[PDB]
Amino acid sequence: RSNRPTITGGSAMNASALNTPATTKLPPYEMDTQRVMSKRKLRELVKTVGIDEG
Amino acid sequence: KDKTLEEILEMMDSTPPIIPDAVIDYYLTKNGFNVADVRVKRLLALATQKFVSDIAKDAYEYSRIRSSVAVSNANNSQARARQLLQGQQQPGVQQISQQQHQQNEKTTASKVVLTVNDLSSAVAEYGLNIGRPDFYR
Amino acid sequence: DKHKYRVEIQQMMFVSGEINDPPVETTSLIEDIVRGQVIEILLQSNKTAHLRGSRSILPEDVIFLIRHDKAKVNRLRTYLSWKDKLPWELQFMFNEHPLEEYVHWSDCRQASFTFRKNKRFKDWSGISQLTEGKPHDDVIDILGFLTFEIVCSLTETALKIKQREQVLQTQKDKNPLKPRHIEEAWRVLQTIDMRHRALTNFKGGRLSSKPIIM
Amino acid sequence: PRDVRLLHLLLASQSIHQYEDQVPLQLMDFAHRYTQGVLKDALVYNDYALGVEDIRLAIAARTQYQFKPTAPKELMLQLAAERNKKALPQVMGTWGVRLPPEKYCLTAKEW
Amino acid sequence: YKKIVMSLPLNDRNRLKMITKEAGKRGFIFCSVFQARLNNIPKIPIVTNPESLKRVKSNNLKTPLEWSQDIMNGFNVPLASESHSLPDTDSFYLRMVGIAREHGLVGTVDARCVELISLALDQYLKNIIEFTIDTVRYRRKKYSDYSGLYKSVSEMAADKRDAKIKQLDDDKNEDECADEAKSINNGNNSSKDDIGDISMSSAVNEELHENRTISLTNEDIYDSLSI
Amino acid sequence: TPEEETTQVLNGVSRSFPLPLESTVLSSVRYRTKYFRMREMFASSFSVKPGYTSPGYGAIHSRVGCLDLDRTTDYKFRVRTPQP
Numbered sequence A: 001r002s003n004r005p006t007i008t009g010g011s012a013m014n015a016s017a018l019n020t021p022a023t024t025k026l027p028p029y030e031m032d033t034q035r036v037m038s039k040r041k042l043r044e045l046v047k048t049v050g051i052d053e054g
Numbered sequence B: 001k002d003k004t005l006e007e008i009l010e011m012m013d014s015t016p017p018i019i020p021d022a023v024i025d026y027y028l029t030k031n032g033f034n035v036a037d038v039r040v041k042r043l044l045a046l047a048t049q050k051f052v053s054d055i056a057k058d059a060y061e062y063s064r065i066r067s068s069v070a071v072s073n074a075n076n077s078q079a080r081a082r083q084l085l086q087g088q089q090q091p092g093v094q095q096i097s098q099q100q101h102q103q104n105e106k107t108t109a110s111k112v113v114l115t116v117n118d119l120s121s122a123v124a125e126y127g128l129n130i131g132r133p134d135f136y137r
Numbered sequence C: 001d002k003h004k005y006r007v008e009i010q011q012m013m014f015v016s017g018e019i020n021d022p023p024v025e026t027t028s029l030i031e032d033i034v035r036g037q038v039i040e041i042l043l044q045s046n047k048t049a050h051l052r053g054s055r056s057i058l059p060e061d062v063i064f065l066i067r068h069d070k071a072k073v074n075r076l077r078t079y080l081s082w083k084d085k086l087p088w089e090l091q092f093m094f095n096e097h098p099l100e101e102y103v104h105w106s107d108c109r110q111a112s113f114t115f116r117k118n119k120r121f122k123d124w125s126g127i128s129q130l131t132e133g134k135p136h137d138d139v140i141d142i143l144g145f146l147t148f149e150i151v152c153s154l155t156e157t158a159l160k161i162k163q164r165e166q167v168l169q170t171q172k173d174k175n176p177l178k179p180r181h182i183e184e185a186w187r188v189l190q191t192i193d194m195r196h197r198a199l200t201n202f203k204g205g206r207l208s209s210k211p212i213i214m
Numbered sequence D: 001p002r003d004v005r006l007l008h009l010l011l012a013s014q015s016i017h018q019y020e021d022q023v024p025l026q027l028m029d030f031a032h033r034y035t036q037g038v039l040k041d042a043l044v045y046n047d048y049a050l051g052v053e054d055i056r057l058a059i060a061a062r063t064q065y066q067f068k069p070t071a072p073k074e075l076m077l078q079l080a081a082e083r084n085k086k087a088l089p090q091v092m093g094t095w096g097v098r099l100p101p102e103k104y105c106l107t108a109k110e111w
Numbered sequence E: 001y002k003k004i005v006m007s008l009p010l011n012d013r014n015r016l017k018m019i020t021k022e023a024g025k026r027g028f029i030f031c032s033v034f035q036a037r038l039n040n041i042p043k044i045p046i047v048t049n050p051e052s053l054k055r056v057k058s059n060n061l062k063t064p065l066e067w068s069q070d071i072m073n074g075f076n077v078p079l080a081s082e083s084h085s086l087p088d089t090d091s092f093y094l095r096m097v098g099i100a101r102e103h104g105l106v107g108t109v110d111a112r113c114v115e116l117i118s119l120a121l122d123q124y125l126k127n128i129i130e131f132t133i134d135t136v137r138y139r140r141k142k143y144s145d146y147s148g149l150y151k152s153v154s155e156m157a158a159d160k161r162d163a164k165i166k167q168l169d170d171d172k173n174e175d176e177c178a179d180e181a182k183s184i185n186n187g188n189n190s191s192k193d194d195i196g197d198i199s200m201s202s203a204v205n206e207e208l209h210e211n212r213t214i215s216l217t218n219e220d221i222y223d224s225l226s227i
Numbered sequence F: 001t002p003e004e005e006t007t008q009v010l011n012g013v014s015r016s017f018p019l020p021l022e023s024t025v026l027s028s029v030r031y032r033t034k035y036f037r038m039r040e041m042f043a044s045s046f047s048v049k050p051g052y053t054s055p056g057y058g059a060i061h062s063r064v065g066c067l068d069l070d071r072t073t074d075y076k077f078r079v080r081t082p083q084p
Helices: A042-049 B005-012 B021-030 B038-065 B068-075 B077-085 B100-107 B116-124 C006-016 C024-052 C059-066 C070-079 C102-110 C120-125 C139-172 C179-189 D002-013 D022-048 D052-060 D073-083 E012-018 E032-040 E050-058 E064-075 E089-103 E113-136 E156-163 E172-179 E217-226 F002-013 F030-045
Strands: none
Touching: A042 C139, A042 E113, B005 B038, B021 B038, B038 B068, B038 B116, B038 C059, B068 B077, B068 B100, B077 B100, C006 C024, C006 C102, C006 C139, C024 C059, C024 C120, C024 C139, C024 C179, C059 C070, C059 C139, C070 C139, C120 C139, C139 C179, C179 E113, D002 D022, D002 F002, D022 D052, D073 E032, D073 E172, E012 F002, E064 E089, E064 F030, E089 E113, E113 E156, E156 E172
């Protein structure tokens, strides 16, 4: 992961070919966890305590 | 069908419990909440009576387990009923009473004692902790 | 270690509800729950039987711990009727007494916890670790029947709360049992009764108690 | 007993010269239960890791929920300052005692 | 003096002991202001002991410049009164590592005890909410083997806070639930933390009718009312 | 004589006062964190004007405790104060 946009790419020297790893892959990321995220959790806790149950 | 509360009060109209009216009245006016219905007083009397029946019954279980005489009487109940049935008229006594004397001075000298060290464990089941030591040094 | 009784736990799970090949984690959690419950049963029964003055744990001494459930001890009494008088009873106060897959459904019920021999059970549960004497007259048969009942009731309530969590999930936005289902089934089965709490409710102090055995 | 008369000297040391008979018995049956619970929890905490820091852990486990808390004046001062933000309401000016509204009084109730 | 009948039947060992006690047996403190001060201040672990210095240098644990930052980052967590939701794993982790740096533990906090704390909060609040729920209602279908919808109010979570008082931490939280949870009907609860002032009844002041524009303090509180 | 023994026994009982070994100060989470946060803001805001030194450590800049890595069961410790 290297998001620095400056000359030398946040490295001691500006070669930029000598200061970069050989074989890389994509960094871990996550999508928008809006659907799976609940603003209120205590309402879910009272929901699993107090259900209708007839 | 499980009885509704109105049926219980309609039966308490006819059958009053053990704890009489004035004991319930003293505990009422000791805890506030003056009520004028006799059936609520009889229902609270029956509730307290049932709760202490359960506590004293659990004390009876804890006092019958913790004595070797009671579990040995329950083990050898019909085994000694055999000896009592073979205890016929006087011809037939010489082959018995090899074990009768020791449990005779055990079972006839044992009366069930409601004890502090028994009730403390019967209500430590119910949430209390009645810790009375056995000596004071 | 652990994971000793996995296939037998699966066999006892099959009798309660559907099986759907339960995972390693559910069987491991049920094994650790039953291994804890057996140690608590043996500790309470040994504490009760030592004060009588006999280190040999009697058969009735473990039925003492489940004396409240009358239907379950009647079930134990019918379970002790194919091997081809309680001390706290009403008669025993007084001194003297007078004179196609249905077959596959059944064979899973015949599969038990400690039916074969008490060889893996004795060093798994640790019978010799906490018992001061030699209890093995019928304590192992009752300690098999109790674990069968524990696993049956535990997976029954875990199935019912999995179904209720399923209907709660399909109502919120509109197959296998997990460790969270077993843990909340444990929370359902380990709530103290109201009559066993009544005498500490208005006074404020942290209730110390004992683990309720099934 | 030695501790009945030691409790006599303890009660007299704090200027308590009139008391009943079962009061040192109640103090001894409190101290027995308290020391037994503390030593049982300390035996648990020593099997975990006897000593004095073990006793300190076992008596800090149960200080947190039963006896009188320590230095509660600054929390009570903070709590008072949260309550004494609101200025006082408007009072009646008819020189008497005014009741709450009728639903907030113990009169419109039924048995 | 007059206690010859009582101080004499103590045994000789007991009396030879109890003619020796004094004040100065301890190394404690008893000034409650100073106890509250030491419970208030944030403390960072330092090192002077050489064996513990080589023990903490071997396990790559850092100097106190990192533990002080960990104190600050464990304090700067949006604690659960402000967020109005139960906390998550990163908030749990940061608060517990800040607390463990407060107590002295310079190691690493395990990743399973956070989930254990989560299930602890689960069963704690489930116990409290369940024994508030079964008091406003008698569930006839439950509690048996053969009316509408109720919302629990703060007066009810004070009313069954005392009928079953054992269920609490007995810390600050129960003190505030007993002391400040009940509100009188002029309490002005649906607010913005400042509108219960007396000057919000008496007229927004306007602006800049002056060469030097110094204003009054009754306008500064209207200025801070908007934010 | 029993008289000097009795008066010295009463002298012994009049000098013994117990302290508790463990006392849990009644406090809060929220008032502690809010005290810390407001003190951090107003400690980072102004300056110190020292004689020779300022209080605080890295990113505290206030009166900070000096609990050791060992002796975590001690009842008192040192604090930081600007020394001239």
